Every structure is written in C-alpha cells, then in structure tokens.
Amino acid sequence: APGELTPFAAPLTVPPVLRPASDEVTRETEIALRPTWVRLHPQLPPTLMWGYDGQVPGPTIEVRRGQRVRIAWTNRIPKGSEYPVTSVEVPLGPPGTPAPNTEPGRGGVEPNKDVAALPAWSVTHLHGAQTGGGNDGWADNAVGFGDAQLSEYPNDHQATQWWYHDHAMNITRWNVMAGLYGTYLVRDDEEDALGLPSGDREIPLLIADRNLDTDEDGRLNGRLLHKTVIVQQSNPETGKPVSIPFFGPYTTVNGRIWPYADVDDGWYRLRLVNASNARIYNLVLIDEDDRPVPGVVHQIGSDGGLLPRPVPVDFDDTLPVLSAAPAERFDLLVDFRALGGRRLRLVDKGPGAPAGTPDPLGGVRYPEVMEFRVRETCEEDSFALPEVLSGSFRRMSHDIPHGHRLIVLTPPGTKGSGGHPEIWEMAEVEQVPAEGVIQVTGADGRTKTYRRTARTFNDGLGFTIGEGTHEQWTFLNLSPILHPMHIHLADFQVLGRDAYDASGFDLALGGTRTPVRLDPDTPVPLAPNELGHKDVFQVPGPQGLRVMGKFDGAYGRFMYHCHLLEHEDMGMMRPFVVMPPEALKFD
C-alpha cells in the first residue's frame, strides 16, 4: 500500500566476529557502548541506536570451552545524548479491530518525558553463561558514561549459543530495544566432531520486532518507538494506567527489517535467538505459493547446547510452527539441497490465518521475517545427520536427590498487585481461605496447602542454594497468559507439564476458595524440541511446569524472572543465592 516498506529489499548482514581469548588473561577486551546510526531499511532514513562497539546487533563473540575471557563493558555514550527509544502508551481501539501496536506512529499521544530524560545507564548480562554473580550483570549495577562493568566468563560449558544484552534495573525494556543485544557462541570438541556446516554456512540470526514513529502526514521516520496499549486506564489499587507488553509490526533480522539472504543449494546452520521484548515468533518456512516446506529444517541444539537427537521441523501437525519465545535459542540445520533456483520465506504465523497471510488482528499485520534466495550449484553436499546427535547428553533423572521450589505465576488483576502479573514464591504448610494461601489438588488426588512468602523483586530473599545441588522447580501459572521464565546460571531439563483448573483462585482475595486442581484429562505433551538443555522455557497457563537443574560451577546472587521485558521491569523478577555448602552452615 501507500507508505509501506517493501519486504526483502536489502541483503542480510551478520555482526562482525570477535575472538577475545588470549595468552594474557589480565588483558581485557573493551566492548564500548556507542551511539550509532542504523539503516533499518533502504526506504527509511537512518535510525539512532546504541550499539556494543557501535554495531547492532553487537559483535558475535566466539570462544572455545575452557578459554577464560575478560570483558570490559564500557559505557562511551556521551552525557546529553538523545535517548534512542521514544515511549508511548496508547488507548485501546474499537473492539474487534487490529490493536494500535499493529501500527507505527504515536496516534497523537505525547512521547513519555521520563523515558526521553534517560541518560545512558547500562549493565550487560551474558544470558546462559555459567559464571559467578559478580560477572553476571546484576541489574542495579548499571554504569554511566566513562565507567565500566568488568566480567570474567570462564566458559567451562559445552558448545552452545548464548546471547548478551542490557539488564539495567527498571529500564531494560528500553535499553535492549535501543540496540544493546548480541550473541556469543561457545565451541567444543563434541560439536566439532559433528562436522556441522560452518564459515559462510553458519549464520547467527538475531530476530526482534520493532515499531517506528511517523511524521505528521503519517510517513515513517525511522525513530524507534516503544508503543504499548493501555488495558486499564486507572487501576483501582494505584493511581496508574496499566499497559500490555511491547509488540511491533516490523521484524528485524540482524538489525535489518525484512532482509533477504542469498544461499547455495546446500546445508546451512542457523543460530537463532529471539531478542524481542515480548513477542513470540511462531515461525514457518514457506515457499513461493505460501506452502510450508517439510523435511528441510532440523533442530539440532537449544539454549544449553546439542539436543540428544535432531528434531524434524516439518510444519506439519506434530510441530506446525517453530515457537520461539524471547531469549530462547534454536540451533537449526536447513537443507537447501533440493531447492536451487527457489525462493523461500520465514514468516510469523498468526492464529487467525494461514502461514504467509496477514493477520493484523491476531497481532501479525506483516508475516514476513526474511527470505532465502537459493542458487543452484553443481555441488554435492554429503553432510550426514545422525539419528543420535550428542553422545554427551545424559537425561536428568527425578531419582537424583534434590530440593523443591514452587513458583506461582498470578493473573494481572490479583489482589495487592497493582494490576500486574507477579511471581509468588510459595512455602508448604504442615485460617483456611486466606490472602496469599493457595491449595493444590495433585494427581494422586490429595490436597496440599502453600503460603505466599514473596510477591516482588525486592521482598526478602527466598531461595538460598548450595553449590552443586540439584533442585526441581515447579512454575505454576494460574493465568491465561504465557510467561517465558528464565533462570540465570544453570542448565535445566524439562521433566513434565500438567494442565490445571485454576478457577478456584480468587483474584479479589489473592487466595484459593476452592483448590487449584490438576486436570488429568488434558494431557500437555512436551514439545519435541524441549528435551535437551534449556534455561528459558515457556510457561502457558493455566498450567504447571516441572524443570530440574544442577546449580553448578559458580557462586553469588543471581536472578530468575519472566523474560517479557515489560513484566521484568515491573517487578516480575527475583534474586537467588548460590554458595558453597560449607558456607551454608553459617546461614
């Protein structure tokens, strides 16, 4: 239409590669945060962003397992710099019409001045890294211009895809959107012996949705626009309006809106991460006629490394979409051998229309993510994918002695919560229907009682954990909304999912009237791609999720939280501490 960007007008780029490992461990690699001008699209003007080394995404850091590395994340954004991200909250639109976050522009609403007034204040978190809390990017310890955050990463972890981004307390949703994100690949001998496509044929893909502001006649102007929609104008408990997380109509891949990539008719490896604030990409690979393309994509790794077996992603009805929530990583082989001279598209699928078809109304006005243009060669790729991938993979057993956490996730309108969803840490009991008490009727048909002991980031510490121990964490989502939960430090495995009836939960009370009931005639199968190592799993509701993990290889104070950046900036986050068992004896 008039005023729309043409998809696939510009080629894909990849961030420059950084290899920081050296003989001299005391010689840090400075990674300087600097303002930079970014061409999102040939049809836009340049866009002001903040980049690690002036690049968006940041450089792709590459290391080998065991190579000890030191990085100085160094704020070089001058005092007085314009804040790259304009922020607005806008009214709801007419019902049954596309929400305003399906559109650019502010619709008359004034940029929020308090965001405009943000100085550069940043802390970098290497998401997925096994490293002590002093290295982790703790949210309060963001630094201003001239100052550094120093991180050691021992990198004593199997080959995987990590990624790094701003984590500044309360403002992570803006800082990350400004451009502070990048990926970080660890290599090892096990991965090497797989003989995976590499060099030219290994492509990091950092995808993120954006919105843009518009000029006064409605022309897009390239300015980053964090636009949310108000679902409650005035919250009964507080003064304040209440808004949903960020979703935008434009999809960026490696810092470009809707790029194309020229590839050969061979095997390729994609290191995919969703770096979006909140959007879940339900990805489908489709051909010129919008037909999903089976038998071509294979998932081979996940957050924490190689899967035990490759998972076919055939966009059939065993896995119709590859669902990628914020912060999740997918190690994908795609096999273009039979596809020379073809053009294929990765698209976000809307719930209300086929893959490839706009569904503005399902939150996907523009399906396009990126295009592959496959050149016919006369070459023969004999790459072999084995049926078992990793010989190192050992399945997590519930038989290993472990401790237990229950984390309840609550509906937004819950009592005492100011209209926001929350993390509630729960402790079991051994004054029935009361505030902060939740009963649960388990599978075995019996009922336990739990009390709420923390509801927000700054409540007193709940989880203190001996280094080297295993713990099973249950996330019990009592709401209809999906929270991609993330735990710093550790690798976990998914043990089980169960559906619940949660209509026993009284929002106005903030407790159960009648118990939350496991619902055993709704099986929730595990996704076929979540049986490896994960550190950020999706938790729909009403449901419960069982993960297990070894808290291993480092110490300190760490975070777990929701990875919708808006919910994270609004209290949906908790600390935990990992100490030597021997220091645990002193409390």
Add this chain to the structure above:
Amino acid sequence: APGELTPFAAPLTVPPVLRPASDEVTRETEIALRPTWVRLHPQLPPTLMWGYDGQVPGPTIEVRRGQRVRIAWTNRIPKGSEYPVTSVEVPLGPPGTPAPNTEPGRGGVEPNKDVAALPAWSVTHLHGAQTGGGNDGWADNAVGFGDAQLSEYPNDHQATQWWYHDHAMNITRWNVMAGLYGTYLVRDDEEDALGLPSGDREIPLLIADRNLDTDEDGRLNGRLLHKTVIVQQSNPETGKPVSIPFFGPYTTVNGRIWPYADVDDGWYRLRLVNASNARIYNLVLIDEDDRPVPGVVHQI
C-alpha cells in the same frame, strides 16, 4: 536393516606422523593423553575416547635404527573425567542362537559402577621395544592426572612395526579400549635398500573390534561398550561370576568403523596390527562377487 550402519560410508584416515629424533636427547617429546571426541561413523554421534595427543589411534611414531629417543607419556586427563568405556556382563542366552556379544547394547544389565569410577590411570608399553625394564611400561606404575611416565627407547633393532598401548595393572582391557593405542615404525638401511612402496603408498592399519551402547528404543548411541558374556554365574571356588573375553560386532580401522580407502592401481604397503582386546581376525581379500583374490597379497 533399520538401525544398522552402512559399511564404507567414510574414508580411511591415518594418525598424524610423529618424528621425535632430536640432537638433544635430554629434550623429551611429550605425548599427552587427553579426552577426545571421535566420529566412529557418519551415522553415529561422536564418541568419547582417551587419546595420545588427543588422537585415536595415537600418532605414528617414526624413528631410524639407533636414534635414541625419550618420551614423556603424560597423563593430562582431568580428574572427574567421565570414564569412556561402559562395562557390562550379560547372561548366556539360548543355545544355537548368536551370543549377546554379537549385538550392541546392554540388554537389561546395569553399567558396572566400579569401572565407571575409574580415574585416568595409565602406563604406556612400547610393544616390541628392546629397552630396559625402567622404560618398558611396568603395569603397576601407571600415573594419574598431571604426572608422567618417562621412557628411553634406544631403538637398536632392525626395521619393523612396534605398537604402543596402555598396560595399567588390572584395567588394561578398558584403558586400551578407551583409545590408548598407536603404532611405531623403525626404519633402517636394509629395508631402505628394498625400495618398498612408501609415502602415500605405505598405510598403517590399526584394526580393533568395538561394541556400542544403545538408547532405550535401541538406537546406537556411539558410547564404547565392553560387553562380556557370563559362562558360569557362580564359580564353585569363589563367590563370583566368570565371563569370556571381549568380542564386539563393529570393526574399526584407524578409529573408524568400516572405512573405505581410495588407492591407485599400484603396489601398496600396509603395516597391519590387530589392537583388539581378544578377537582374532581371519582376514580375506574378496572382490565384488565375494571371490577371494589370489596373487595380490604378499607378507614381507
């Protein structure tokens, strides 16, 4: 058949060549034992092994008769390392059917926990070598992580093929299987004067049979499996069961199951050693119709 490897799917490799002779005899060549992942077959995942210089087979050492050589066989396998070889003993199975050592997997049986607890404890024996007992790899004198066994080999012996391998007291059967073997060639003027095929045309072949573990659905998982068969469950004299030696279904040549080798229509020299625990290979050269080929092989 479903779940079977395709023979001849990957090319033969040869260990890298090592040439330790030097003008300063007091400068040892360090040969460090390390964990390594090796791809036995394209249809398998990578396999955990222990290798001399991270190589399985270890490097082909080459020396001339009279070149005095000192080697520090140096344990660099980190403490806490997973032991690479899984050990089980399984019951007989029905008479007139293939023995269980004919099949991959453990069947029901538990990995032996004592073998799984082994730390890396190795001593290296140069099999063939004429050198004093101090150098020969006495079996009790295995070394743990961070230490070395030092060996002088005067190499005063006519040209031949020797081979080297772990010789650790009581655990040799697992250590060698873990990957600790390689070959060692001595050259001299007499063999040189025969002008034998050399370079590209001399190929060491270290053959060894192996067994592998399976997952629950019975897929091969690349994990080294030392699986022996119980022939007497309770020996009258001792508490304990008695099992036969190791035999396994897969043949590796230079660390690859059933490789192929591209050669020219010319004379080749093969330096063949059987590094198996126990299997005696009864070797036949056959053609595409399975006919044995006469007039082609000569042992020298």
